[PDB]
Structure 1
Amino acid sequence: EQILVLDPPSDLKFKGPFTDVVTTNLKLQNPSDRKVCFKVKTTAPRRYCVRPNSGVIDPGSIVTVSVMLQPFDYDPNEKSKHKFMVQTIFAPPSDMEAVWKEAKPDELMDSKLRCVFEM
């Protein structure tokens, strides 16, 4: 199960107009006694900038991730199909590449969030 606590836990809302970049924030809280590594993935990678898109969260700490929806012609009739995934693993004791490739599938935790466009 996911160790991190996400606010919002499951739907990311974005408020228009969308003639400019619209940011929504994702709070990642680590309530646990261990460092936790995270990486953000999306079903629509061209459509968003995510900053940071990965990192490490110290025990007890919180990191707020900025999710930047790129501008587009908004169809108030089309409901978003976009999703995000926050993948996590407890931090091992140099390199973050090496960390993800070494990770056993049993170690990995995911949260998924659905995006929602409101006007």
Structure 2
Amino acid sequence: HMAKHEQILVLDPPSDLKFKGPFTDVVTTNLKLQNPSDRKVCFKVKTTAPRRYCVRPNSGVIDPGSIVTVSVMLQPFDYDPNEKSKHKFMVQTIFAPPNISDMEAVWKEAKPDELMDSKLRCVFEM
């Protein structure tokens, strides 16, 4: 089907999440989400490799004009030249109906065409 809207949230960084080594300990990079609309927007952060990342907060609601900082923590790991990881992060969002009574209901009653997605590439720099 046809998506109802393009992504409303503004992301910083907009496309790539860079993690600088060494990776002997947890390496964290931030992702700021800003809501320029006059409506409340709910979000969920997802990844292609959950075991290698910890995200906080991984979901929430952003009020009109507000901004939230998401901490993305890459878990320590031993570099393997034989590994070819191309991890991606996704910020999935949805407008909260103005008359809805709780956040859980926003996602429970959501239709596919009401979702907005943004993808970020994870880059590991030595």
Q: When the two structures are superposed, what TM-score results if normalisation uses the length of structure 2?
A: 0.88
Post-superposition shift, 1:78? 4.8
- Unaligned runs of 5+ residues in structure 1 are none
Alpha-carbon displacement from aligned partner over 1:44-98 (angstroms, at most 9, x marks no partner): 0111000000001110010010000001012467553100100000122454332
Alpha carbons of 1:96 and 1:26: their partners in 2 closer, same or farther (altered >3 Å)?
same
Match of 1:63 among 44, 68, 90: 68
Aligned length: 119
Alpha carbons of 1:92 and 1:69: their partners in 2 closer, same or farther (altered >3 Å)?
same
Post-superposition shift, 1:101? 1.6
Using the alignment, how far apart are the partners of 2:56 and 2:76 within structure 1?
Answer: 17
Using the alignment, how far apart are the partners of 2:102 and 2:64 within structure 1?
Answer: 19
Whether the 8 Å contact between 1:84 and 1:112 is mirrored in structure 2 is yes
Post-superposition shift, 1:10? 1.0
Using the alignment, how far apart are the partners of 1:116 and 1:60 within structure 2?
Answer: 29
- Confirm or deny that 1:116 pairs with 2:126: no
Structure ID, larger Rg: 2
RMSD of Structure 2 on Structure 1 (CA): 1.5
Post-superposition shift, 1:13? 0.4
- Unaligned runs of 5+ residues in structure 2 are 1-5
Alpha carbons of 1:76 and 1:116: their partners in 2 closer, same or farther (altered >3 Å)?
farther
